[PDB]
Design an enzyme around this catalytic site. Structure first.
Site, PDB file in Angstrom:
ATOM      1  N   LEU A 163       0.851  -1.223   0.000  1.00 28.21           N
ATOM      2  CA  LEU A 163       0.000   0.000   0.000  1.00 28.21           C
ATOM      3  C   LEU A 163       0.877   1.261   0.000  1.00 28.21           C
ATOM      4  CD1 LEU A 163      -2.919  -1.175   2.296  1.00 28.21           C
ATOM      5  CD2 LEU A 163      -2.758  -1.089  -0.242  1.00 28.21           C
ATOM      6  N   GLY A 221       7.777   3.906   3.092  1.00 22.70           N
ATOM      7  CA  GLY A 221       8.386   5.171   3.513  1.00 22.70           C
ATOM      8  C   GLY A 221       9.855   4.989   3.816  1.00 22.70           C
ATOM      9  N   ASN A 222      10.408   5.894   4.607  1.00 16.80           N
ATOM     10  CA  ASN A 222      11.692   5.690   5.316  1.00 16.80           C
ATOM     11  C   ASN A 222      11.272   5.091   6.665  1.00 16.80           C
ATOM     12  OD1 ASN A 222      11.997   7.556   3.165  1.00 16.80           O
ATOM     13  ND2 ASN A 222      12.449   9.240   4.547  1.00 16.80           N
ATOM     14  N   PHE A 223      11.826   3.930   6.989  1.00 15.81           N
ATOM     15  CA  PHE A 223      11.696   3.308   8.330  1.00 15.81           C
ATOM     16  C   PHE A 223      10.361   2.555   8.468  1.00 15.81           C
ATOM     17  CE2 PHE A 223      13.329   7.830   9.290  1.00 15.81           C
ATOM     18  CZ  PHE A 223      14.641   7.566   8.948  1.00 15.81           C
ATOM     19  N   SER A 265       6.815   0.320   6.213  1.00 16.17           N
ATOM     20  CA  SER A 265       5.968  -0.033   5.065  1.00 16.17           C
ATOM     21  C   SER A 265       4.579  -0.483   5.538  1.00 16.17           C
ATOM     22  CB  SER A 265       6.648  -1.082   4.213  1.00 16.17           C
ATOM     23  OG  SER A 265       6.794  -2.263   4.967  1.00 16.17           O
ATOM     24  N   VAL A 266       3.581  -0.257   4.690  1.00 18.49           N
ATOM     25  CA  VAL A 266       2.197  -0.745   4.896  1.00 18.49           C
ATOM     26  C   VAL A 266       1.847  -1.709   3.762  1.00 18.49           C
ATOM     27  CG1 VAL A 266      -0.200  -0.066   5.340  1.00 18.49           C
ATOM     28  CG2 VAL A 266       1.629   1.278   6.261  1.00 18.49           C
ATOM     29  N   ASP A 309       1.246  15.261  12.077  1.00 16.82           N
ATOM     30  CA  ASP A 309       1.449  14.862  10.655  1.00 16.82           C
ATOM     31  C   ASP A 309       0.121  14.943   9.897  1.00 16.82           C
ATOM     32  OD1 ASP A 309       3.108  13.997   8.480  1.00 16.82           O
ATOM     33  OD2 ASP A 309       2.932  11.859   9.104  1.00 16.82           O
TER      34      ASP A 309
HETATM   35  C1  LIG Z   1      -5.782   1.776  -2.535  1.00 20.84           C
HETATM   36  C2  LIG Z   1      -5.328   1.805  -1.107  1.00 20.84           C
HETATM   37  C3  LIG Z   1      -5.947   1.201  -0.003  1.00 20.84           C
HETATM   38  C4  LIG Z   1      -5.335   1.496   1.191  1.00 20.84           C
HETATM   39  N1  LIG Z   1      -5.831   1.100   2.388  1.00 20.84           N
HETATM   40  C5  LIG Z   1      -5.314   1.242   3.645  1.00 20.84           C
HETATM   41  N2  LIG Z   1      -6.009   0.765   4.695  1.00 20.84           N
HETATM   42  C6  LIG Z   1      -5.477   0.948   5.911  1.00 20.84           C
HETATM   43  C7  LIG Z   1      -4.307   1.648   6.123  1.00 20.84           C
HETATM   44  C8  LIG Z   1      -3.792   1.829   7.528  1.00 20.84           C
HETATM   45  C9  LIG Z   1      -3.664   2.129   4.957  1.00 20.84           C
HETATM   46  N3  LIG Z   1      -2.504   2.925   4.941  1.00 20.84           N
HETATM   47  C10 LIG Z   1      -1.691   3.467   6.019  1.00 20.84           C
HETATM   48  C11 LIG Z   1      -1.101   4.388   4.862  1.00 20.84           C
HETATM   49  O1  LIG Z   1       0.306   4.172   4.822  1.00 20.84           O
HETATM   50  C12 LIG Z   1      -1.342   5.872   4.905  1.00 20.84           C
HETATM   51  C13 LIG Z   1      -2.589   6.489   5.445  1.00 20.84           C
HETATM   52  C14 LIG Z   1      -1.308   6.627   6.200  1.00 20.84           C
HETATM   53  C15 LIG Z   1      -1.906   3.600   3.788  1.00 20.84           C
HETATM   54  N4  LIG Z   1      -4.183   1.960   3.744  1.00 20.84           N
HETATM   55  S1  LIG Z   1      -3.940   2.456   0.907  1.00 20.84           S
HETATM   56  N5  LIG Z   1      -4.215   2.475  -0.761  1.00 20.84           N
END
Ligand SMILES: Cc1cc(Nc2ncc(C)c(N3CC(O)(C4CC4)C3)n2)sn1
Ligand SMILES: Cc1cc(Nc2ncc(C)c(N3CC(O)(C4CC4)C3)n2)sn1
Lengths: 279, 283
Positions: free
Chosen positions: A14, A17-19, A21-22, A129
């Site tokens: 998804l 970053g630095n430090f 990943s999601v 942030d």
């Molecule tokens: C298309 C798509 C779907 C996503 N869903 C999703 N669901 C939960 C989280 C915690 C998440 N993140 C954390 C993220 O790093 C940034 C908001 C801070 C992406 N993403 S992300 N892209």
């Protein structure tokens, strides 16, 4: 609710970053593709590990309609398991679907961000942030604050938190006192909220982005130094094109140099809700 | 009022085209810097053919009396009645195009809809004279003050034939043109309505250069054929300008109806006035 690593199945990255990943994962103890899709954050130092442990406990302590749901943890390093929100960041959603999102819809999202921030306030948590890239879209009518990686707990006896971090900071979202003295508060969250309002009403157009505009106004000294001097001389982001007068006014009040003259999130929610009804 | 050349004092160039110039002059018969400031249109390097068109343009403007149409004041001949100049009222804030680029941070959607309403009323009035403007664009609207705009050029305007509802014209602003204008050079009230849709688009994009009708159409076009050929094909396949960022649903709907391929399905300027006015009150 426990999560075994062996049942956590990688689907897609998804964000990286630095430090940190999601990842989108399927939690599938029945290994039939039926298990639930979840978001999993993990590290890619002892200092970043400390921050991550605290970030897990911060999110675990939050229960609110407009805050991404904590689901649990998964250990071998530590992973943070969250609900997966299918429409992703508000930043990406709005770029994608802007032709179908009017001012009324923006004000709905704005209201929900304010309510999540009001709730953070009651825990004495400073987000640090607030940006559309850190807000998530559950559906057409609900957004959630979706990351707490920089969030700090106020000392018991102070209204600000001073931070010693040497990493990159999102400086074009930062309050002057954040830039000059690394002081973070509810009032620096309100400054950052003003920049979120700006992001939404510019529809995340690249040529109007906070970094684009500040760098245009800046033209041997760091960008940070030029930005502090520009904000000290009351340089501000311009009114987004077609932004209602009362929404631009809310932005300009959020961007007061004096921390003590910035609106409360309770007041912002009320004023945004009233603009929305008036429309 | 007759205007003598000898009393017309050039102050500044307002604009310059292929065949024409517009100048700010002081009309000063008392030669004490007291006389009235006026807008003066003249031919650059006149043909007899451009001169004929300009004489017709003058009579068109002289025939128009309306709050939202720039005022005709008279004509100016050089010695020997050699050169015709058109004298107009001077509107100090200039083209809507330039005013909006300059003052956009102080112009909200309510204000845009006030301007939009006034353009519709001027266009409705043109309609009653059986005049087709052909060149409806924010560069051809003028700002008298914060609360009043006027159509301010009639250089392409045609009179309908007595027995038809279109005129067939035997460079053009192609990115404002209706498909039947591009393919058959047919101009009507319906092709004016199409062009109005593009004016509404210009206003709601705040004249941002990255979102201009030529920018967006050229992006959609991307080619061994003329741009006009690519444009006709794009419009035939229902390619359209996108919704401007934060354009209200009902204003984007008005734009999309103005850009119907079928002339007979485009709204009337009387209906557009009503609908714009109602969106403005609702806001
Ligand atoms: C298309 C798509 C779907 C996503 N869903 C999703 N669901 C939960 C989280 C915690 C998440 N993140 C954390 C993220 O790093 C940034 C908001 C801070 C992406 N993403 S992300 N892209
Ligand atoms: C700053 C400024 C002020 C202007 N005023 C003005 N007043 C009257 C007319 C007829 C006029 N014109 C004709 C023009 O060629 C285009 C609209 C069609 C400009 N301009 S112009 N700029």
């Amino acid at each position: 609710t426990q999560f075994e690593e062996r049942h956590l199945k990688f689907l897609q990255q998804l964000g990286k970053g630095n430090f940190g990943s999601v990842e989108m994962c399927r939690y599938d103890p029945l290994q039939d593709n039926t298990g639930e899709v979840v978001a999993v954050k993990k590290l890619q130092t002892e200092e970043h590990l400390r921050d991550f442990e605290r970030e897990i406990e911060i999110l675990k302590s939050l229960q609110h309609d407009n805050i991404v749901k904590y689901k649990g943890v998964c250990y071998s390093n530590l992973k943070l398991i969250m609900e997966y929100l299918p429409y992703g960041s508000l930043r990406d959603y709005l770029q994608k679907h802007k032709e179908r999102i009017d001012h009324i819809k923006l004000l709905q999202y704005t209201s929900q961000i304010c309510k999540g921030m009001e709730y953070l306030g009651t825990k004495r948590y400073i987000h640090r942030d607030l940006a559309t890239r850190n807000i998530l879209v559950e559906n057409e009518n609900r957004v959630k604050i979706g990351d707490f990686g920089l969030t700090k707990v106020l000392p018991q006896d102070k209204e600000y938190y001073k931070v010693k971090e040497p990493g990159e900071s999102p400086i074009f979202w930062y309050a002057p006192e954040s830039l000059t003295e690394s002081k973070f508060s509810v009032a620096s969250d309100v400054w950052s909220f003003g920049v979120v309002l700006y992001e939404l009403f510019t529809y995340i157009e690249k040529s109007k982005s906070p970094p684009a505009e500040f760098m245009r106004m800046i033209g041997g000294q760091s960008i940070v130094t030029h930005l502090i001097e520009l904000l000290k001389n009351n340089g501000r982001l311009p009114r987004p094109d077609g932004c209602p007068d009362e929404i631009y006014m809310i932005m300009t009040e959020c961007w007061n140099n004096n921390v003590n003259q910035r609106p409360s999130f309770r007041d912002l929610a009320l004023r945004v809700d009233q603009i929305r009804d008036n429309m």
